Amino acid sequence: FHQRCRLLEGMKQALWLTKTKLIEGLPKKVLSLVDDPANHIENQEQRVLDIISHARLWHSTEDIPKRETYCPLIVDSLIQLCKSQILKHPSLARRTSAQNCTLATT
Amino acid sequence: RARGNEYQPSNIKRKHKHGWVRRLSTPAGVQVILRRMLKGRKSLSH
Amino acid sequence: ARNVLYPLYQLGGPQLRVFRTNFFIQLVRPGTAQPEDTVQFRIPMEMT
Amino acid sequence: VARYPPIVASMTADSKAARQRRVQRWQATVHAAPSVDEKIRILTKMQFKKYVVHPQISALNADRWYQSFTKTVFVSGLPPAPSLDLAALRAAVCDCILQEQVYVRRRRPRSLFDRRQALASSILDQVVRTLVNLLAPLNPVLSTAALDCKRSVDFYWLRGEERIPAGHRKGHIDALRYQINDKPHNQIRISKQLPEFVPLDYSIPTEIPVMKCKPDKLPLFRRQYENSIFTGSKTADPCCYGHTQFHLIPDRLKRERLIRQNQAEQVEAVFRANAIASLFAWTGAQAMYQGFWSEADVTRPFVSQAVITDGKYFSFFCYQLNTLALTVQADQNNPRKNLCWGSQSQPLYETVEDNDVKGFDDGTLLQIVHFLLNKPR
RNA sequence: GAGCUACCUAAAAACAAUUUUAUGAAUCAACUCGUCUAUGUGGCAAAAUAGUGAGAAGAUUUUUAGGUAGAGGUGAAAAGCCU
RNA sequence: UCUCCAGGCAUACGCGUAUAACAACUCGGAUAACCAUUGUUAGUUAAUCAGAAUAGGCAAUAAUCACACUAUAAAUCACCUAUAACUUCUCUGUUAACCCAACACCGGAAUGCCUAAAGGAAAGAUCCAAAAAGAUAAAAGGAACUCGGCAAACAAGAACC
Numbered sequence: 001f002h003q004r005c006r007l008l009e010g011m012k013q014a015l016w017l018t019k020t021k022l023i024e025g026l027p028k029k030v031l032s033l034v035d036d037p038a039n040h041i042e043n044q045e046q047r048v049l050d051i052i053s054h055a056r057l058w059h060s061t062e063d064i065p066k067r068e069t070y071c072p073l074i075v076d077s078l079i080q081l082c083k084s085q086i087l088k089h090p091s092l093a094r095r096t097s098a099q100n101c102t103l104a105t106t
Numbered sequence: 107r108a109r110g111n112e113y114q115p116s117n118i119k120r121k122h123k124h125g126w127v128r129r130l131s132t133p134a135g136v137q138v139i140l141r142r143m144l145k146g147r148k149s150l151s152h
Numbered sequence: 153a154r155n156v157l158y159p160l161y162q163l164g165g166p167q168l169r170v171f172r173t174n175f176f177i178q179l180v181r182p183g184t185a186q187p188e189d190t191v192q193f194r195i196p197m198e199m200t
Numbered sequence: 201v202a203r204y205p206p207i208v209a210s211m212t213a214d215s216k217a218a219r220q221r222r223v224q225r226w227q228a229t230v231h232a233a234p235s236v237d238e239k240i241r242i243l244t245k246m247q248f249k250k251y252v253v254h255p256q257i258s259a260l261n262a263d264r265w266y267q268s269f270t271k272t273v274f275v276s277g278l279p280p281a282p283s284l285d286l287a288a289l290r291a292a293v294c295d296c297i298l299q300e301q302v303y304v305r306r307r308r309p310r311s312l313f314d315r316r317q318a319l320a321s322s323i324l325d326q327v328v329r330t331l332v333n334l335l336a337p338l339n340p341v342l343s344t345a346a347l348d349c350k351r352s353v354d355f356y357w358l359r360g361e362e363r364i365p366a367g368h369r370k371g372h373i374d375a376l377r378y379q380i381n382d383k384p385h386n387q388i389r390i391s392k393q394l395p396e397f398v399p400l401d402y403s404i405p406t407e408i409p410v411m412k413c414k415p416d417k418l419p420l421f422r423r424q425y426e427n428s429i430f431t432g433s434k435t436a437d438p439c440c441y442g443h444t445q446f447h448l449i450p451d452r453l454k455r456e457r458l459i460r461q462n463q464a465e466q467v468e469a470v471f472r473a474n475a476i477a478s479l480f481a482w483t484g485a486q487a488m489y490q491g492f493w494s495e496a497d498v499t500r501p502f503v504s505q506a507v508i509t510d511g512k513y514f515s516f517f518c519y520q521l522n523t524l525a526l527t528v529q530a531d532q533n534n535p536r537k538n539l540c541w542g543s544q545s546q547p548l549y550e551t552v553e554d555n556d557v558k559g560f561d562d563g564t565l566l567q568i569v570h571f572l573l574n575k576p577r
Numbered sequence: 578g579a580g581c582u583a584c585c586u587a588a589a590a591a592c593a594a595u596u597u598u599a600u601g602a603a604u605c606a607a608c609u610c611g612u613c614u615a616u617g618u619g620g621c622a623a624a625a626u627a628g629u630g631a632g633a634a635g636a637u638u639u640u641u642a643g644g645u646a647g648a649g650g651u652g653a654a655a656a657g658c659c660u
Numbered sequence: 661u662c663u664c665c666a667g668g669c670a671u672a673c674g675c676g677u678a679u680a681a682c683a684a685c686u687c688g689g690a691u692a693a694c695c696a697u698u699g700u701u702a703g704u705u706a707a708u709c710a711g712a713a714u715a716g717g718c719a720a721u722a723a724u725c726a727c728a729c730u731a732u733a734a735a736u737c738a739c740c741u742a743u744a745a746c747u748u749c750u751c752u753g754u755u756a757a758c759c760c761a762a763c764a765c766c767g768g769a770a771u772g773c774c775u776a777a778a779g780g781a782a783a784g785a786u787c788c789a790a791a792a793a794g795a796u797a798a799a800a801g802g803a804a805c806u807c808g809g810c811a812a813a814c815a816a817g818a819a820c821c
């Protein structure tokens with residue numbers, strides 16, 4: 001199974017292959033983390049709108065940027081915004097990222 | 107309208123139609139070359 | 153060298169040495185204005 | 201009380217004075233233009249054949265030529281003149297370098313020539329991201345900043361005039377158009393303007409090199425495409441000023457290749473040419489966003505920084521955009537010249553073996569940290 | 578001999594503003610065409626010029642390369658076109 | 661410097677030195693000045709502009725700001741599985757007022773951007789004749805002109821076969 005592979009049955013086939021049971025909705029532990037206003041970022045709503053506007057219009061000289069340049073930008077921008085919480089939580093300094101990694105199993 | 111400008115030069119069109127490789131493709135074209143060599147022509151084709 | 157055969161090169165071939173060279177070149181006065189370092193030459197058309 | 205008509209040239213006459221008055225009429229529309237975007241549109245709506253300046257260029261002595269195109273004086277050294285977690289920053293920088301070469305897999309490249317360049321690009325990209333985050337607690341400005349990778353910075357300006365040498369327009373006056381279209385590897389854009397490195401109008405003994413010949417002698421050709429003044433983001437972007445630029449020298453221009461080509465002196469000239477070209481384009485574009493253009497000289501100098509590397513070595517340059525009035529009409533009696541300060545290249549790390557980076561020099565890391573920590577007043 | 582022209586294949590490009598609506602509909606440029614009058618008539622022109630007119634999101638126009646050849650080709654048939 | 665006109669700069673196809681300076685004043689420009697002409701000398705500088713490894717496996721889901729919205733004419737190598745090779749800058753295009761029309765032809769010529777910041781000059785000097793061509797103005801009348809309201813009009817509205 002590789003990137004381009006498309007399962008005809010969608011989720012159901014994936015469940016059978018990996019022997020997993022599906023629960024709808026994120027874990028309550030994850031959801032409750034952002035319900036606390038202490039985790040809320042300053043000007044969160046405004047900054048997100050700028051990122052969306054930057055992602056789709058302002059980043060390229062052209063008029064209508066193509067999806068080959070604003071789906072990576074939107075995700076990269078948000079991660080570089082969520083990663084601004086190092087000020088509140090110094091523990092976030094213990095992580096780093098990579099690009100186009102290779103994962104395989106048998 | 108106004109005639110006289112039928113010739114619309116294109117080097118790709120010219121060489122394909124009356125070129126060396128085009129002439130040699132058929133024996134009827136090779137006999138065009140053979141006669142031209144007999145006469146003494148400066149240019150045997152395009 | 154010009155008007156001579158260059159041996160065909162395939163993987164692992166020796167280096168090509170031309171002991172006596174047919175390329176003869178001449179230095180000309182620039183037609184336009186050129187930087188002090190720049191120098192103009194007229195060379196055989198087969199020279200790289 | 202005789203209301204004489206003004207002693208000015210006719211608008212519609214076919215004369216040099218009449219032509220000049222018509223030019224002033226066009227400039228008037230720019231002056232009265234309501235918004236910056238309309239100002240830029242009026243300036244660049246017409247496209248003429250323009251030299252294409254390349255910040256990363258192999259031409260000999262491109263640095264000196266680029267100064268004349270920009271009127272930038274290169275002064276060697278740094279501009280005239282807290283607690284840091286060096287263990288964390290030093291360890292983090294090593295992690296990015298080591299993680300990439302020793303660890304991580306990806307799919308081994310196909311072309312056998314860009315592998316080292318591809319490896320060099322990723323270490324630079326990752327190191328910048330980590331430092332921005334790791335330096336964020338020390339400087340909160342980076343949190344408000346925007347980090348862009350491989351975005352486009354453009355600037356189109358007029359400097360000098362020439363008489364058309366041949367054709368039907370022989371002898372017609374033609375301005376010399378230059379443009380810079382650049383894609384800096386990494387850049388930081390901040391809303392607030394950075395502090396000045398020197399008071400505006402500061403005079404220095406050094407003078408711009410004057411080139412006898414035309415710009416075509418060093419390989420530099422002309423094309424007619426869209427003129428664009430772009431700061432890496434559109435005018436609507438709240439973040440319009442600049443903080444620092446990261447540039448990667450291409451493989452062809454690396455130290456070893458130049459030595460074999462016998463152009464040893466160009467080892468550092470390559471760095472100077474890119475720094476002058478890119479920073480002027482970035483700072484120059486910023487001024488247009490604030491509304492300043494050639495006739496209306498910038499009241500407040502614009503300052504930006506850049507760091508240029510070949511993968512291993514690093515050199516840092518500082519720039520100040522004293523003037524945009526780089527035209528024959530607007531440069532008649534202009535005593536202000538742009539100032540650029542540069543430092544020699546330093547090797548960040550000698551080489552990597554096993555899981556340790558050999559020959560790591562803290563001085564290079566300290567200088568990078570100082571640039572990132574510079575903040576608006 | 579299909580670089581003109583009739584037709585076709587493939588790869589492409591152009592179409593503002595306005596009103597309808599959701600279109601081989603409307604007003605009208607670019608653009609395509611060529612109803613009428615006038616001038617010209619060895620003419621600017623071996624078919625043009627000045628006005629006036631028709632279409633202008635479509636059976637649309639245009640570009641590039643290729644194919645069909647005379648006992649033939651092509652033809653929304655004028656015995657029309659094929660330098 | 662003044663007066664006035666309003667398709668201009670690039671690209672492609674094409675053309676092939678018509679480019680530029682000097683010198684000539686035979687020829688060419690339908691006349692002169694000047695050269696587009698003659699002779700000699702020069703010229704257009706690119707890793708970015710432009711042009712020129714193998715064997716398998718397998719793709720239901722247009723475009724139009726693609727979200728909503730529907731429709732019908734049903735609509736552009738990649739990614740994997742293995743083998744092979746492990747560090748490069750050569751070559752060619754680049755000039756001009758240019759091409760198809762025997763012509764320095766009121767004709768034909770595709771795309772990009774812009775509409776004067778770019779590009780240009782209708783009159784060699786004279787003169788005010790007839791005829792001819794074009795533009796504008798008209799007392800009274802208003803198609804009485806004519807094959808016909810052709811052309812023109814301060815009109816450009818209505819109905820019919």
Ligand SMILES: [Mg+2]
Pocket residue numbers: 110112
């Ligand atoms: Mg003929």
Ligand SMILES: [Mg+2]
Pocket residue numbers: 114
């Ligand atoms: Mg044709």
Ligand SMILES: [Mg+2]
Pocket residue numbers: 219
């Ligand atoms: Mg002019």
Ligand SMILES: [Mg+2]
Pocket residue numbers: none
């Ligand atoms: Mg054809």
Ligand SMILES: [Mg+2]
Pocket residue numbers: 583
């Ligand atoms: Mg037909």
Ligand SMILES: [Mg+2]
Pocket residue numbers: 592
């Ligand atoms: Mg339309």
Ligand SMILES: [Mg+2]
Pocket residue numbers: 610
């Ligand atoms: Mg017709």
Ligand SMILES: [Mg+2]
Pocket residue numbers: none
């Ligand atoms: Mg109509």
Ligand SMILES: [Mg+2]
Pocket residue numbers: none
């Ligand atoms: Mg109609």
Ligand SMILES: [Mg+2]
Pocket residue numbers: none
């Ligand atoms: Mg219609």
Ligand SMILES: [Mg+2]
Pocket residue numbers: 654
């Ligand atoms: Mg019939």
Ligand SMILES: [Mg+2]
Pocket residue numbers: 660
């Ligand atoms: Mg015939």
Ligand SMILES: [Mg+2]
Pocket residue numbers: none
């Ligand atoms: Mg000449």
Ligand SMILES: [Mg+2]
Pocket residue numbers: none
């Ligand atoms: Mg002369």
Ligand SMILES: [Mg+2]
Pocket residue numbers: 690
């Ligand atoms: Mg003539």
Ligand SMILES: [Mg+2]
Pocket residue numbers: none
């Ligand atoms: Mg000559």
